[PDB]
């Protein structure tokens, strides 16, 4: 009614107080934009906010920045009471520094410049905690000052840009709910996970008798995975803040420090700890130490700490009402029982991130420093710094940007001041140019280890050429079981995996099934030849069979197999015969005994098929063959114009005549053309060949006219048979 | 302004006080070539220094000699007050050795010889410690003497070739910073790399307050690579050196001698010293002995070890304002947890030479003994002993010219002079010719076990033929982009 809730800001508007709230929901409220908000809810907390509308938001929620709900202490679902009030502004504030564990705080001077600027009208009250980032990455981060006494107190004030700022500096701690605790938006990662995995602990933790008995039997244990300290680690710590309740620590150096007798018997002593602390949750990392048990022998100690913590937890009637958790690097190093009932049995697996995904891990590293997504909307942009970087994590990119970091440091601090005290002047000089994080990219420090991993392209319909009739074709099969199966069920026809091409090698063929997964706004799933070679030798060729498994929860999502049958005639004669390899029948007996009506689409491609199974004729696998025909005068013209549309214009390059010409150039051809007579192409460099429509015809007959009538005569014989 | 840079001399200049300063620096301090130099910094320590052009550098920074730096204990990017004096010359010097863990010193004639022609107008004072290498490579390096009274004392001097020089022999010990430091200068290797391993614990080792939490957080562990004792151990050693704290030893015979619950207290009792002589650096070349576990079993005490060392650093809140690092052999053995947050972070690949890096690597080595660089243009020059040798690191280097040497030994030292007192005669005798070298590369001492190298070669185009057709095209596809 009044009741809007609480959620963790997507636009983060690292001003504080700045809180959006939906044009559609403060129209509920009857509170116009732009006003002073008073957030009055249990417990008689109070915080003031200033409205600004987001968009896809929608009125059932309000979506709350963290430190405001840091402040009012507030957890996703409470009740608070706003309403607009009246507007005033400062006059002279005075602030003090928050000293628990912060070893004192700054010292010399920006008691105008950093706090005045940073300001930027925001509604608040005395004796306020106000978060101001910014200025780097190290050194300077979300930071909490105690407001003493402002003029006006207690009533509603917006600082303003002519007001002064005094810091008192005398060392206090803070009156309102300092750091310490991560809240979900100081949390970033999986969206969807991150609601999944908490809320089956969500109810039972907060109250007992909410959620108890009544739905289902409460969560027992929940294993997780993924880089073990990255921030995945910080998660466990994190959850504990919101519910309140003890946090208990399993970790690496007390069980490395206590041997035969002293851990024996810390087992139970933390287990102590847990029926006092209890309601309390119980978080593992230590998995991989505890129990890496494949069955072999670790010695005593190893068998004696695993056999322990299932007792421990079979020692407890699972009733005290609490919660033990586990955590480890991968899906491996985990033993085996840990499966079996009477224990842990939910097993959450923690995945990577995605294009948006990473900015949402970006956004929580993005703000110790004075960066911004609407007042950069590009250049800074998270997106920007996501398409480059492949294959990280929230640790690596925090040690990869403050790594960065000294790039911003070594144009500045090194050679300007040396001194221990801060000039006023050195705080302007603090930026963040893209350079600085494109340095690091062009350096050795990206690397990627992991096995299994995901992406979506860029490539749309303007960019692709001719073949429309494949084009209609591509969306028949793939988008139409989407949005008929009502339609689907009135012709009742009978299911399939997906269609096949063949053409010279990434002709249009790469692109064509590149461009569907976009326009579909689906995922896209890619197993290529290349990518195959990284697997089996890592010993991932096991892991696609979970890959196969992987494609159901990504759903809907193209999966897309090439030229993992290339090294199956090696052994034995496949191309109709159909005698493969240990490994592909992996793929093959996959394919028949996957479910069918799923968001996943079988495609596959070849330069002539030349590889297969009578099997994979066959239904329930690979299915009718799309032929690729080459680009006609009218595809050539199209694509032609998709190539020189990034290069200069001019009449000296003319696309009518060489199109009449040569009827038989496939897609690769007129994709190689381009780059290596495009540099001859005008003047990008002194030689003679610029600026001539013969330049294109030089290289046209170095290249092969790639004209064949046997092989597209192969394609039907092989086809209809 | 006065302010001129301290660096690591490239053109060493053996000789010290032949600091080279650039024609373009001094005349930003209006100061002519060829005159006597004032060096005067924060602690009143001061120090003289001729000056002679070199050419690559610019005026941004002076590069400066080692020793001179360790006179005046300068490290990289600190403030001077130079400019040009009155020029007089000695008469006569007294000198005194320098007896700490020396054990005594030389003890026949060579007051003059040995002395006087290594001279070659040194500018100095009174009490200043001289370094003069030569004569050898086993049994003389740089030595420094403490110089007791000059009749012109205090005033700019010259020490000439007509000046006599007398030496006390009175044990006694250095008036100013002796060695067992190891300066950058007198480090050699990667250039680049070592600028960027120092860069990050630079700022933070100096001063607490200068960047703490300012730019990032700071390092948390660092793993080194490459010859585990080469002169890479030794730069463990030398880094302590220029930051002047306290350098934590974790080594092998201790380990090793540290059975079940002697090596599981001894972990927290060089933990409890580091927290006591914070700041310090905390030094591990044992990771290959400590942590080399692959997940076998390599029994209880491998384990133990591991798992403290891990609790160890997660026992610290990450600000005793210390920093531990880590180095090993190769990119191998080593805990594959290490690499997990809460721990060691920053992992820093050492490699290997090149034609240009091994120069680098042997000037360290190169100057125990009488050669030249710019007085020995070609013949006697690190390139032509560079091009041959592949596959090779310092200590190798240093006891493969060490063992050329005795080279220069067998033909001279055993069929001359077998007597305990050192002759003045065969000092003259003692040079290098570059056949001793050349011998040792025919003799089978050179092996190369390492997988991974690379190279640059010597091949111009006028050696190259026709199909200038390709050429061009070479130009194309590779010099364009």
Request: aromatic share 4%; charged share 30%; with cysteine.
């Amino acid at each position: 009614g009044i009741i809007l809730r609480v959620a963790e800001a997507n636009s983060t508007d690292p001003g504080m107080s700045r809180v959006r709230l939906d044009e559609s929901s403060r129209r509920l409220l009857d509170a116009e934009i732009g006003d002073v908000v008073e957030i009055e809810k249990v417990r008689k907390t109070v915080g003031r906010v200033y409205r600004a509308r987001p968009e896809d938001e929608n009125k059932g929620i309000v979506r709350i920045d963290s430190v405001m709900r840091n402040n009012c202490g507030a957890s996703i679902g409470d009740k608070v009471k706003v309403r607009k009030v009246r507007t005033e502004i400062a006059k002279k504030v005075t602030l003090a520094p928050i000293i628990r564990k912060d070893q004192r705080l700054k010292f010399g001077e920006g008691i105008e410049e950093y706090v005045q600027r940073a300001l930027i009208r925001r509604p608040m009250l005395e004796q306020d905690n106000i978060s101001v980032p910014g200025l780097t990455l190290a050194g300077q981060t979300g930071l909490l000052f105690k407001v003493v006494k402002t003029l006006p107190s207690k009533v509603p004030v917006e600082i303003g840009e002519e007001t002064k700022i005094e810091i008192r500096e005398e060392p206090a701690s803070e009156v309102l709910e300092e750091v310490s605790r991560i809240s979900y938006e100081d949390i970033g990662g999986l969206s969807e996970q991150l609601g999944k995995i908490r809320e089956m602990i969500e109810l039972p933790l907060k109250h007992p008798e909410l959620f108890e008995r009544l739905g289902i039997t409460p969560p027992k244990g929940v294993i997780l995975y993924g880089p073990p300290g990255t921030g995945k680690t910080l998660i466990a710590r994190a959850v504990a803040n919101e519910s309140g309740a003890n946090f208990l620590s399993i970790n690496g150096p007390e069980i490395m420090s206590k041997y035969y007798g002293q851990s024996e018997q810390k087992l139970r002593e933390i287990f102590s700890k847990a029926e006092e602390t209890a309601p309390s949750i119980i978080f593992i990392d230590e998995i991989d130490s505890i129990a890496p048990k494949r069955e072999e022998v670790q010695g005593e100690v190893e068998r004696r700490v695993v056999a322990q913590l299932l007792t421990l937890m079979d020692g407890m009637k699972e009733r005290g009402h609490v919660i033990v958790i586990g955590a480890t690097n991968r899906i491996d190093a985990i033993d085996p029982a840990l499966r079996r009932p009477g224990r842990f049995d939910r097993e959450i697996e923690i995945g990577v991130p995605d294009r948006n995904g990473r900015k949402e891990i970006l956004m929580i590293h993005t703000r110790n420093m004075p960066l911004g997504m609407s007042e950069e909307e590009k250049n800074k942009f998270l997106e920007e710094m996501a398409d480059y970087t492949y294959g990280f994590v929230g640790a690596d990119l925090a040690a990869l940007v403050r790594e960065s970091a000294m790039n911003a440091l070594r144009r500045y601090l090194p050679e300007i001041d040396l001194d221990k005290p801060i000039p006023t002047e050195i705080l302007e000089k603090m930026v963040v140019t893209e350079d600085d994080f494109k340095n690091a990219l062009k350096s050795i420090e990206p690397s990627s280890l992991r096995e299994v991993m995901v992406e979506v392209p860029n490539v749309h319909w303007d960019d692709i050429g001719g073949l429309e009739d494949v084009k209609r074709e591509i969306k028949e099969t793939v988008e139409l079981p989407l949005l008929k199966p009502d339609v689907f069920k009135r012709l009742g026809i009978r299911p399939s995996k997906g269609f096949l091409l063949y053409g010279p090698p990434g002709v249009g063929k790469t692109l064509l099934a590149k461009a569907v997964a976009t326009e579909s706004n689906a995922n896209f799933i890619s197993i290529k030849g290349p990518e195959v070679l990284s697997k089996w030798v890592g010993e991932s060729e096991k892991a696609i069979r979970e890959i196969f498994k992987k494609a159901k929860q990504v759903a809907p999502a193209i999966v897309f197999l090439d030229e993992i049958d290339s090294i199956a005639p090696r052994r034995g004669t496949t191309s109709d015969s159909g005698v493969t390899e240990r490994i592909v029948n992996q793929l093959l007996t996959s394919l028949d005994g996957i479910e069918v009506m799923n968001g996943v689409v079988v495609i596959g491609a070849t330069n002539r098929p030349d590889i297969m199974d009578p099997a994979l004729l066959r239904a329930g696998r690979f299915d009718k063959l799309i032929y690729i025909p080459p680009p006609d005068k009218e595809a050539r013209l199209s694509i032609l114009k998709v190539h020189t549309k990034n290069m200069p214009l001019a009449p000296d390059v003319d696309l009518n005549d060489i199109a009449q010409r040569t009827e038989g150039y496939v897609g690769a051809d007129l994709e190689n053309l381009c780059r290596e007579a495009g540099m001859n192409a005008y003047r990008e460099n002194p030689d003679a060949t610029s600026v001539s429509q013969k330049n294109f015809l030089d290289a046209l007959k170095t290249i092969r006219p790639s004209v064949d009538e046997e092989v597209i005569k192969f394609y039907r014989t092989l086809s209809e048979t």
